[model samples]
Target: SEQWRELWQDALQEDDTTPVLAHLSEDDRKQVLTLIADFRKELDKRTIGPRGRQVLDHLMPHLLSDVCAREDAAVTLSRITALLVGIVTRTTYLELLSEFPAALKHLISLCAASPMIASQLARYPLLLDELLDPNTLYQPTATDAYRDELRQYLLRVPEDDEEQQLEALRQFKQAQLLRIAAADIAGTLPVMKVSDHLTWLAEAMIDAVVQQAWVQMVARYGKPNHLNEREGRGFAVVGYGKLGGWELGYSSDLDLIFLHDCPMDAMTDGEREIDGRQFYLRLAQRIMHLFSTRTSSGILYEVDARLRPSGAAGMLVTSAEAFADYQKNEAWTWEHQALVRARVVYGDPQLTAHFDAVRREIMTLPREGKTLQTEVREMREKMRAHLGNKHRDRFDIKADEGGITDIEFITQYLVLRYAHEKPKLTRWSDNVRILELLAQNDIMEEQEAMALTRAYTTLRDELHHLALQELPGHVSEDCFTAERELVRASWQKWLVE
Candidate 1:
């Protein structure tokens, strides 16, 4: 009962270690010691940090302390995790990695005993750079640049080339990236390489997850015969977000968007073609289960509503409509744009058509509206500010007279103006970096630039609160209809045909 109290007393009174350990009764000491031992075994059966330090920090002391008659297991475990996690994050873990050899050995033993923990642990990226080092894992595959080039080659196709050939190449790239990235990430994880045993286990687990996902989809939603009946039409499963880009993290979710090709007109032909939308929803359900993999990858697949970042795969109209809507939003996340680059890795032509239609719609939409011009403008600005001010670049601003670059002005403008006005705002870095780089190229300059940043920051902070506070007054409960009418009228005039 006085465990924590005694420790505090010992610290506050003197460096009297003897009194604290002497206070515990023999039976109480034995019980606490047993519980601590059990806890270590449990934690051992769980995943650790990238290099195993986190797990050890959480697991070790209990095991060691009990053996050494220091049975306040929980405190030791908690302190280690907190201390090491802080150390690892703040300093160059790569440089101080010598600190992890002891922790790594203990964590590896735990991984071998628990596959669930191993898979979950594999998701962290702490040791990724180290794992990717040529000497660390299997000889480094071609450089990161090479993998990117492979994808680029797959992405490009002559307008005159056969579409099938282009499509095939794209699929090949998708599969290749999945394999390469997974291996690269896995290599960095600390999985006791006893005879290269854990590496094989890790690979098989990943592949098993993928295979299980496919099988589960087919079993639950597979309707090979559904198309013949004319229920609706075949649909495709579209991946968006991290899954779409194939640059997913250990804890990323799988997004599944669906589109069905059935029309009201299809009712007349009524042989039951496979309700494409329904099939996809069912298939997606299965995919989620597999990726979540009853064992738990500590990540899950979700039905993304943010359109492109969602599982944006489906029939033509569905894909087109979603893509069109997605492009309209100014508040896009990093994953939002990433999802747009996805391909139809699984599903039918009807699904492909829907996805392609969206692509076409996005391509045709005026870049001024859908494109993150404001966001880009902001990134350039931030980059400018950092470079000019922090790094003391050529374009540093004068305090009073003010001679700053246009990039600096725009950087300030965006961070202040757009990010503040919009309902969604990303971090300030995006704007800061963008502007800084532009200034580096001399695309921005002073006068207008200096005030631009000032204007933007002022508007974002001050105006944002003003707008929020006025929201209720802007449109009242019953006057809501009136407000909508006013908005509609204003929007009509604001928009160009």
Candidate 2:
């Protein structure tokens, strides 16, 4: 509708004519230059409607293919993506990809476009595959109205354009942001094998949980304005514990650490003392309520005044009085829970400084060391007792989702106490090498090895299945029957029989 009004103004402002320049056409050439300048000015002023789903809905079917072909197609797609960043869902992008399989090839041709699109689209699954594979490209022709141009552009690489190259670099950086977002949103169990289905399923579950958290956060506050006018002053969500280690399994808690600061000049010893100790504590408390569940470890507010950055006068603790007392030769306890890995999921770049300082201090304490050793022993011992009673002797069905689901925990426990009577090793110092050492020493049996493999494979397969809709009838029927029998055999044996 708006197109007609703009074109009408163009029609009234200029006369349209066709001229041949075989001879004495200098006058026509001058007229063409004037017309071209006017068109450029008009284009600059044209109003693109505020990004909405309908705008993308209209574009995907028509211009998507053309975008794949243009030297600037990737840039256009990225612009289109940025425009619709907050509105479009990951599911919507997957639907669009289903409509045009060759979208991948064009995306690749505009190789500069990968990082931006990849980051946002990673939640779709198999997207990384699209970016890396060359065979996904298809030829565009007369009948293929949408992607034909893109097909041609992708058929042969174009000469390097500096602007496009620079855009590609920017895309790479932007894509990393998206990649982290996707991983954070959809965590999977760490496993490496071509045919490990169960592990994949567990990862899918983790991802779904993580993605749900992101959706809730976005719903409340709006799309993250990481590059807003007040970019310096904002909160960041950090991943800690299992999620932070990139070793999440099907049912582990998503431990988060919140660090916040908005001022660019919020540095220096005095400034650092306040922001590092006071600000992050408040930010962590607020975001923790956003989730339905409270964190496993309660909130942290203690500031070791003695450890405050240099040049800051007094000690910094969660409370000024505590800082004064702790400074007066009070011995603080360091527990095993605090000795785990920590990663920044969200927060300012300056927050990294905070994590670096705390993480360094925490790593020095032993799991079974003086003050916090008993707490660490209790935690690990509890996990060991639970696993022994539930999983060690029997290979039952529901065992997969039970507390024993965390393979990392199971692996760590087995490596330490596989020989019932003797404790061979201490911790996961070099996990793989330690596993090799255990195998060499007659600790891991063939049956146990295969059992671990099956557990991983079952979890992986279940997850890949979720990226799809309903399964076929027989598969669905079998799944239900297995679940029924598995439960009946366990707690409901008398009821069913």
Candidate 3:
């Protein structure tokens, strides 16, 4: 409270309050006094003659009106002013009030509409900076640009201090996510690019995490057994689910499987030789910890490693050969379904190549049509029973009948069914691409295939919007009726029937 008084004193010159303004109520004056203090210098340097007072004169009523109805007026204005002060400048303040007249109005409406957005803006002020750049506010940078940005940031951090490195990593992830989210909320980025940018963000973080883990591990435990000078000891991160398919949403968890090719029992070629297995296991743990644990900036993502070789029972990091064997023999139908969306997101190039070869081979194996169909249908029904929404009215966009999951299941089924006959079917990870391929190959009617894709995009966009606003996936009973019906008919015709 004393600080506000100081801030108020710092903002106003006793002589600046003219007689016309002196008639203003004391309570209103105090509110505007603090607002001027929060943005003192900018307002001081810019407003020529009476312009500063004019801007304040214009801005005060809007601010007061916005908060007047709310019981939490104090909290609301604090949050709103924090953002407005960051945005308004000497040259832009009047201009924004004029051209973007409804800007604050819209913001008030949005903030009131969702506590999620209000809290997010309060938590991360940097997002407000991006809002100033209308040119790129909605459009995300290219994936390569994001990659370079992340690498450049990591390169600047000190290599010797692990704690500093972890903080840097968390901050980078949070800042980039904020930008992407800002773009999404602005309605600038398309749904596909939104997912692409989100996926790219994760991939960049994973790369940084792996490199840091490598440096930390090698320094203490020595290098793992290398194939040659150029072909260095390496590990791979295989992504499953949304991350793997490049279909990640605002809240998607990373489903990851760690794989390495180092000899199981061989000792490292370092001063303190340890088992190759131990070194890699530690590296994987460090990477996971860096990714999944809470930090000052917040956790990067919730990681689920249960989709690995033997699920939760499997090793944290498995040798490449062992991974191949498990996939061929012990892995179940659901694992293969999972693999339909799996891809190498991080790790050594050589190891990624190895994993890709194994994945392609396993995914392409031809099966008896009847047996494959029966198995896939059985798995789908089982998932529906366990995870799908039971509501017949309002539906879950993801797991309810004729929802996103149904679309994904159809895409995965097409890949598993036809990839052996047509190698091109397995080339892409995204469901949209896979669906187009299925249509192009006459596996499904073109119109029907297009309908599914449209439905998928509509549902995904809605889901992204819901997530951005901090809401759940629930929609009205009649929402996406045509899309849902299309998917429902297809699911019954192809699988249920």
Candidate with best lDDT: 3
The lDDT of model 2 is: 0.35
What C-alpha root-mean-square deviation, in Å, does candidate 2 show against the real structure?
19.6
For all candidates in order, the CA lDDT equals 0.37, 0.35, 0.73
- Could you give candidate 2's per-residue lDDT for residues 1-497 as a string of tens digits? 33322322343343333222122244543443343334334433543233433444444434434442354443444544443342243445534544565564444333334343343343323344333433322211122221233223233433233233223222322232233223322342222321222222223322223333444433434433333554343444444444443433322355543334434334223322333333434433433332333222221112111222221353221332232233233423222132233444444455555554444333332333222334333454465456432433333222332222333333443432332332343222222333444455566554444444444445444433322212211232224344333323321221112
- Residue 458 miss distance in model 3 (angstroms): 1.2
> What is the clash count of model 1?
48
On residues 168-279, what C-alpha lDDT tens digit does candidate 1 reach at each position?
3323323332333334334542221111222222223333333444454455445444356443335555555434433233223454454545443222222444454444
Worst 10 residues of 1 by lDDT: 468-477
Local distance difference test, candidate 3: 0.73
Q: Model 1: runs farther than 4 Å from truth?
A: 1-76, 79-104, 108-234, 245-247, 260-276, 288-303, 306-357, 368-497
**Better structure of 2 and 3 per TM-score:** 3
What is the Cα-based TM-score of model 2?
A: 0.31
Candidate 3's displacement at residue 478, Å, is: 0.8
